[PDB]
Homo-oligomer: A and B are copies of this chain.
């Protein structure tokens, strides 16, 4: 039988796992969103067309590097590739654009162009003298945190390049003499972490302000805000986006100890969360990252807010055409944890197999979605959760289970009722029909929402509803979600475009 349906009927979680079947094929519809960092390997229009075909739902632009002119061209190519499919509204896939801020990063300078291997036990002077900012080598290392001497002490550890090189402070005015603990090849402009230090860089720098206002002008759908430590950090990003930017979603990136400790107030202020595991796993012990990941996904699921699992998910795929077994496991387990979206960074921005990495997240996510123990998840989501709109949504999810429906079709202007359905994690895909292009793009933050953009003019109320529902039916049939004779759940508002989404039909597919 398909869909891991045999495992779905188990009465304990242990027997659920015992019943998982590699010969039970999944449905077609892949529910977990796939966010791809764009860069030199993926930014041509022709490659972006294949990215979209392969599964990309959100294009991430990392403003830690690059110029506004460069990112504007990348965004233009994303939209050219996306709109090349706009001819057929039945098959068109909305693609969202995300701006990922630099935030309070610390980076080294450029290595002398005349790369450097740091030898364990060797000495290294860190300098703040900008005279060396492009002459870094094995003896003098410039970095850009001007206040570093005030927050580090003798004994402190300084981590460089994804925490792979470690230094220990031995002498501390405008310099630090360090000893090399774990060495390696030092490159240019590498990230620096000071775990346990009270780094006093601003949450929103002058550059961040410029990048955020640029994002408003470029009509980005969401911001991934780096190094959020507290609710007031989020409010500062909110203020910069301002009223013109009021509909841009703010995803707070949790990647240091304070952001974990203050997670609840951050989540309350944010539209969603990134588990930003790269920095997180340097700021806190690497063996604790999985606790923070499962905490955050759980609390986001409890709150009904989007959560993204990010970073090194398919890392080896930067150089290889197939992932390691731990990478296959990591993607599957993030989906089983409850992540709304999964992300690729260097695998799509700069590696040799960007399309293969997207395709692999698609395949793994689909298999893992079938393996979800919906009986326990749905029961716990219901018990831990009312107004009429919530009741209609949970009623639609139960009806979809009762008839193993091919889809839950939701007519929505802002996405809210589609979000409410997604919160209970139905097995069936949620086809969200909207006339709002921004709603269609932003919907990808939510597990299981397949947004479709209706271009037809407003009809004649009852005919206009029937138009959009029949649109969703054509979408579902064309994409292989269901066929004539299947059953679908349809959700609508009381009238017009009401937020009082209170109407459910159970409809055979003609």
Contacts and interface: CB of A to CB of B under 8 A. Distances in A.
Nearest to A280: B325
A384 B293 contact: no
B299 A326 contact: no
A196 interface: no
Contact of A286 (B163, B328, B386): B328
B328 A327 contact: no
A367 interface: yes
A509 B267 CA distance: 34
Contacts of A385: 402
Interface string A319-331: 0111111111111
Contact of A392 (B13, B16, B368, B504): B504
Contact of A505 (B14, B15, B291, B503): B503
A281 B382 contact: no
Contacts of A376: 13
Nearest to A403: B391
Contacts of A311: 325
B506 A505 contact: no
Interface stretch (A19-27, A62-70, A107-115, A434-442): A19-27
Contacts of A322: 162-164, 286
Contacts of A301: 14
A326 to B, nearest CB: 4
User: Among the interface residues A315, A363, A386, A400, which one has the most CB atoms of the partner chain B within 10 A?
Assistant: A386
A126 interface: no
A298 interface: yes
A289 B325 contact: yes
Interface string A135-176: 000000000000000000000000000111000000000000
Contacts of A281: 325, 328
A22 B385 CA distance: 26
Contact of A277 (B321, B325, B382): B325
Contact of A402 (B16, B20, B291, B395): B395
A318 to B, nearest CB: 11
A213 interface: no
A384 B12 contact: yes
Interface string A495-510: 0000010111111100
A46 to B, nearest CB: 18
A475 to B, nearest CB: 21
A325 to B, nearest CB: 4
A419 B502 CA distance: 23
Interface in A281-304: 281, 284-295, 297-299, 301-302
Given A388-B508, A487-B391, A506-B392, A295 B182 contact: no
A196 to B, nearest CB: 13
Interface string A10-41: 01111111111111000000000000000000
User: Which of A278, A392, A487 has the most C-beta atoms of chain B within 10 angstroms of its own C-beta?
Assistant: A392
Contacts of A505: 494, 502-504
A299 B489 CA distance: 30
A74 interface: no
Interface in A301-342: 301-302, 311-316, 320-334, 337
Contacts of A298: 14-18, 20
Nearest to A376: B13
Contact of A384 (B15, B381, B507): B15
A387 interface: yes
A330 B299 CA distance: 21
A388 B398 CA distance: 12
Interface in A331-379: 331-334, 337, 360, 363-364, 366-368, 371, 375-377, 379
A105 interface: no
A326 B315 contact: yes
Nearest to A9: B383
Contacts of A386: 402-403, 487, 508
Given A287-B360, A363-B285, A403-B391, A11 B13 contact: no
Contacts of A381: 14
Given A388-B487, A402-B395, A294 B20 contact: yes
